[PDB]
Design an enzyme around this catalytic site. Structure first.
Site, short mmCIF file in Angstrom:
data_model
loop_
_atom_site.label_atom_id
_atom_site.label_comp_id
_atom_site.label_asym_id
_atom_site.label_seq_id
_atom_site.Cartn_x
_atom_site.Cartn_y
_atom_site.Cartn_z
CD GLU A 49 -2.89 1.40 2.16
OE1 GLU A 49 -2.39 1.53 3.30
OE2 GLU A 49 -4.12 1.54 1.97
CG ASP A 60 -2.81 11.85 8.79
OD1 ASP A 60 -3.67 10.94 8.67
OD2 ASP A 60 -2.21 12.37 7.82
CE1 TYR A 175 -6.42 0.62 4.08
CE2 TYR A 175 -7.72 0.30 6.03
CZ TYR A 175 -6.57 0.73 5.38
OH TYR A 175 -5.50 1.28 6.00
#
Ligand code: CL
Length: 258
Positions: A49, A60, A175
């Site tokens: 990935e 994040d 996913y």
């Protein structure tokens, strides 16, 4: 090109779950990132990935934010990312390559041109990480037109309505984000709806979470930030960085035989 389908069939031969590391392209430089990727593959990573550097600081954690910043600081651009992708594919023709990127990248030269470029360099799948399912149709259609698997994220509380959509829309892998619904329930329903094989991508920090994911029935696990953390902690020593990546990938693949 059947790269995901063939991988999962061969993993079934091996009675193994897939281990798929994430890294940011160009982190911490172009050549070092190429060699990090060769090391992950040589150590047993089943698919990749790969992130085109993006910016999502409100959400994040520090690991992924700092990797983005290191790549931009090395002067990485999307053009260099695509040339890296082409080189990785030429050196490793069978490994499935999944891109992870953010929508800003495409709304620069257009959705079709982006997926055309993915197809041209040999990417197998694209996850546009910040596009709601409700807005995904132009991305999904462009992916299929260019022989790219569009990746959909199954969130942890997905109801059956959504599971049906995720199962139908995605290709290559699903996913999955699941530590809200039990892990084995999402996995079972995705299989009921003939979804692409599920890779558990939430919290895959160390061997225990890989083992838990396979024991629950997932087809594998994606390590969203643990590889990047090894990069960050070993920046001053490329040799030790690559050695630690090798023992990490080895331990994660051991756990995938659980
Ligand atoms: Cl990520």
């Amino acid at each position: 090109m059947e790269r995901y389908e063939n991988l999962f069939a061969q993993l079934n031969d091996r009675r193994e779950g897939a281990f798929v590391p994430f890294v940011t392209l160009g982190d911490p430089g172009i050549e070092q990132s190429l060699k990090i990727i060769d090391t992950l593959i040589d150590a047993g990573a089943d698919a990749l990935e790969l992130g085109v550097p993006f910016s999502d600081p409100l959400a994040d954690g520090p690991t992924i934010q700092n990797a983005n910043l290191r790549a931009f600081a090395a002067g990485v651009t999307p053009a260099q990312c695509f040339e890296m992708l082409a080189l990785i594919r030429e050196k490793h023709p069978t490994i499935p390559i999944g891109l992870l990127m953010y929508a800003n990248l495409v709304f620069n030269n257009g959705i079709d041109a982006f997926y055309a470029r993915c197809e041209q360099v040999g990417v197998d799948s694209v996850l546009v990480a910040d596009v709601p399912v409700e807005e995904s149709a132009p991305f999904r259609q462009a992916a299929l037109r260019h022989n790219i698997a569009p990746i959909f994220i199954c969130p942890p509380n997905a109801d059956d309505d959504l599971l049906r959509q995720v199962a139908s829309y995605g290709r290559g892998y699903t996913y999955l984000l699941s530590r809200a619904l039990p892990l084995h329930h999402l996995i079972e329903k995705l299989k009921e709806y003939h979804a692409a094989p599920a890779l558990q991508g939430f919290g895959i920090s160390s061997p225990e979470q890989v083992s838990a994911a396979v024991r629950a029935g997932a087809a594998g696990a994606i390590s969203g930030s643990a590889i990047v953390k090894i990069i960050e902690k070993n920046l001053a020593s490329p040799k030790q960085m690559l050695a630690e990546l090798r023992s990490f990938v080895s331990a994660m693949k051991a756990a995938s035989r659980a």
